[PDB]
């Protein structure tokens, strides 16, 4: 299928909430080798976020049930095997995405916006892998996530206004990485609060096409801050 029809189908799948089909379309677009526009990047992002989100939620539920189950109970093995199945699906999705990011997207990005977006995605999917990792594997996965986030964070501070949605989304997810993965609430709050304040100081100059996106992210930054400080 051609790119125009793939995009067409991906938007249909999104409306129908068939995110498997959507991700399949956007993977095909990605593998065609051409740089993605802002619209196409967000379609790729939304597709695989919903695909992986189902596994993340499933994994949490099953892991919580596993941890409440007595180690003597003979049904524990069934729970563990099921957890490992969902975990294996989650790692496969993350691997597919990180493979797309390194093979096509980050490699061929010609602007800092694309590079920051893809590096943010890289931090996101290493972070999802870190949620389900243990021991040294967890440490190395955490380093890979932080490295991607940090690189995108420096490029965004050097190349984007604080009100740019990509820079705000990066701040939002990076601060959550500090809170949930690194377990540093004070640095997470400072990171979110800093991006929030720098965006407010410049909000009056924002373009009306980015109001809805920038302000939406700012609402989320503030919600996280309110939760973390209460």
């Amino acid at each position: 299928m051609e790119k125009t029809e793939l995009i067409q189908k991906a938007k249909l799948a999104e409306q129908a909430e068939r995110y498997d089909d959507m991700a399949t379309c956007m993977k095909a677009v990605t593998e065609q080798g051409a740089e993605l526009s802002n619209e196409e990047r967000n379609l790729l992002s939304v597709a695989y976020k919903n695909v992986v989100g189902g596994r993340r939620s499933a994994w949490r539920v099953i892991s919580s049930i596993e941890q409440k189950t007595d180690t003597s109970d003979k049904k524990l093995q069934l729970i563990k095997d099921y957890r490992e199945k969902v975990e294996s699906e989650l790692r496969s999705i993350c691997t597919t995405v990180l493979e797309l990011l390194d093979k096509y997207l980050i490699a061929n990005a010609t602007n800092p916006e694309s590079k920051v977006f893809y590096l943010k995605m890289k931090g996101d999917y290493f972070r999802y892998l870190a949620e389900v990792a243990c021991g040294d594997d967890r440490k190395q996965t955490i380093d890979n996530s932080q490295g991607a986030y940090q690189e995108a964070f420096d490029i965004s501070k050097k190349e984007m206004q604080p009100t740019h949605p990509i820079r705000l989304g990066l701040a939002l997810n990076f601060s959550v990485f500090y809170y949930e993965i690194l377990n540093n609430p004070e640095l997470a709050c400072t990171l979110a609060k800093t991006a929030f304040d720098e965006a407010i100081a410049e909000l009056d100059t924002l373009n009306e096409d980015s109001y809805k996106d920038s302000t939406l992210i700012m609402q989320l930054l503030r919600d996280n801050l309110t939760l973390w400080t209460s």
């Binding site: 919903n50 989100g53 189902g54 996101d124 939760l227």
Partner: peptide, 10 residues
């Protein structure tokens, strides 16, 4: 209450 990240799954 979860920490909010983007994009958000529907």
């Amino acid at each position: 209450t979860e920490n909010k990240t983007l994009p958000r799954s529907s």
